[PDB]
Design a binder for this molecule. Sequence first.
Ligand code: TLF
Ligand code: TLF
Ligand code: TLF
Lengths: 176, 176, 176
Amino acid sequence: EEEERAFLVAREELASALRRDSGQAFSLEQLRPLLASSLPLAARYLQLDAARLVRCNAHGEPRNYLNTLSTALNILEKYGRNLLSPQRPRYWRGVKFNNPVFRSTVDAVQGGRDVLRLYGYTEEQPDGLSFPEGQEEPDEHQVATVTLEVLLLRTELSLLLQNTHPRQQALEQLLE
Amino acid sequence: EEEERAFLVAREELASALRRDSGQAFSLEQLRPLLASSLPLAARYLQLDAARLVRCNAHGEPRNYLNTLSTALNILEKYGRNLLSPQRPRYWRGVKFNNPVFRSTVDAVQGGRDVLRLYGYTEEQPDGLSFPEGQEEPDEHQVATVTLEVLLLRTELSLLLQNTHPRQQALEQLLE
Amino acid sequence: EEEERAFLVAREELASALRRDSGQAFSLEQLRPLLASSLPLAARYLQLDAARLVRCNAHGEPRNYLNTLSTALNILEKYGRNLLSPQRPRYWRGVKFNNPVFRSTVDAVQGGRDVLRLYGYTEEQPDGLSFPEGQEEPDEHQVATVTLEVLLLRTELSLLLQNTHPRQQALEQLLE
Ligand SMILES: Cc1c(Cl)cccc1Nc1ccccc1C(=O)O
Ligand SMILES: Cc1c(Cl)cccc1Nc1ccccc1C(=O)O
Ligand SMILES: Cc1c(Cl)cccc1Nc1ccccc1C(=O)O
């Protein structure tokens, strides 16, 4: 109720900020209402499958797999920002699996390819994903809300590795 | 390849045996052409998401989570066998999430519900999954195929816990 | 009956052994005095609600629900051993319900949370159970007693599943 409805406002606030300037950086104080919230995972992440992304890649030491996941999300965050840019990349319509950055970051995480589908890369090819040929422009609101959750989850993982998460003790008990 | 053709004829034979008698037990001898197999995991399990079922539930000690996965697969295997039985259960068309057996086994592993969808439980309700209202009879070939893959994966986990897997040393290095 | 004093001498031996070194395992021969005892259940288990742990979870085939209970007790036994360890885990004061191991093992069994309360996790929060903030150290004598009983029940169930329980036939006539 109180925390819920407030969480959705800051969510749509920062999301609409991404649509205005997709290259804008967000400080810790700007993301604090979303990082310090005690709402369940299913309430904070509506599109990004944060549960499967963490659970299906939590192999080995957290210091390693939290870094593997966060770096993959950094790459996925850049894909979402490029779709909201005033000057979109030339090949924005598709992503190739054999890209060296993609292969070493996103394709090192189970579920990384599924995040692209949330952006709109829903058409599967033997060597990549692409937008439907009938789609002229990406859904700016759908892309922005997914981009924010990717950025939020990456920030959460990054703060945990830095021992600076607002709920660091609570989250660490979910990994040990 | 050569081993690919040998795996298909074995898989179709045990599936036919499942349709012939869904209550019969398969010894390790009858399952050796599929257990002692060397093909990759993606070639042995064509429908059962074995990769996610293990990776997304490999938390804690292998002795524990392999037991949680085996028991969940034992329950799922019984669901598929019941769908092929001549005396089908009067409630074969739906599975309830609050069922005590289902809740303590299948709903204890991420991806357990998705296996029922492979059987044909595609329609989702807040209380469970059910067959389409128009589907008169289950897909016998589809149920037998998935049931065989469930039985295969459960056997692999059980043999690994018993230290009797044909490739026990090779698979154990995939858990370190 | 004087077989209760024999139970007590062995119980206190293994209980004191748990506090001296919480990591040392117990062989089948060391536990045989308690496993083969003809004492009633209410006399062998003084704190662990063994009657409810079995009865309230005996749904489906015994081969399945005995495995579910045994795995939950394996996790609960580890919680007790960690509380008696010289190098206690940094988060010993509380247990989170969302922990992946806990959710799939202890919380799959009715009464699992109650065992944590016997250890000292009496304060209930929406996120889990925790020790009272005033308690500087856990009750080493109470935890060792509960831990030994958890270990005893798990061994009883695991031996029953292996068809090696000293009173296998007598116990099997309580489940069929
Ligand atoms: C967000 C997060 C991070 Cl960054 C690291 C480690 C854990 C979490 N949390 C969760 C992850 C998967 C499933 C549930 C949860 C939960 O919070 O209940
Ligand atoms: C079959 C199995 C068991 Cl039983 C236990 C542990 C691992 C496996 N294998 C795999 C499971 C998931 C993803 C990949 C593999 C692989 O081996 O390539
Ligand atoms: C100990 C045990 C196991 Cl391990 C398995 C199955 C049954 C038992 N026994 C009992 C369990 C619940 C309530 C009463 C009894 C009794 O023995 O009177």
